[PDB]
Amino acid sequence: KTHVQLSLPVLQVRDVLVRGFGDSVEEVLSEARQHLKDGTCGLVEVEKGVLPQLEQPYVFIKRSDAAPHGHVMVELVAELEGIQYGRSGETLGVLVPHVGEIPVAYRKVLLRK
């Protein structure tokens, strides 16, 4: 399928043990896609002081449409030194590896794969 219904665990930034997916825009987008497929991807909601606590390059999920079965349609945009790779809508949050952190909530998304 071109789209996949996921429920992403929402993590507090101070709980996150692995604070990014790797060391290049291509690697982080690759890794984010693999973890999203394996159910091992968390979401951190972006506010003042969150991004400097995470590792660049960043992977964002961004609203791609204005929500089948409650799932907001999203796509992946990466960011490194203030340049973004991709063009999409509003940020729902930044993706990180999920290694067993306790979530505060779940974000239902329909991911363009």
UniProtKB/Swiss-Prot annotation:
Domain of life: Viruses
General function of this protein: Inhibits host translation by associating with the open head conformation of the 40S subunit. The C-terminus binds to and obstructs ribosomal mRNA entry tunnel. Thereby inhibits antiviral response triggered by innate immunity or interferons. The nsp1-40S ribosome complex further induces an endonucleolytic cleavage near the 5'UTR of host mRNAs, targeting them for degradation. This inhibits the integrated stress response (ISR) in the infected cell by preventing EIF2S1/eIF2-alpha phosphorylation upstream of stress granule formation and depletes host G3BP1.
Positions of the CoV Nsp1 globular domain: 2-113
Annotated region described as Disordered, given as residue ranges: 1-113
Name of the protein: Host translation inhibitor nsp1
Organism of derivation: Severe acute respiratory syndrome coronavirus 2
Part of the intact protein present: 11 to 125 of 7096
Chain's gene name: rep
Compartmental location: Host cytoplasm
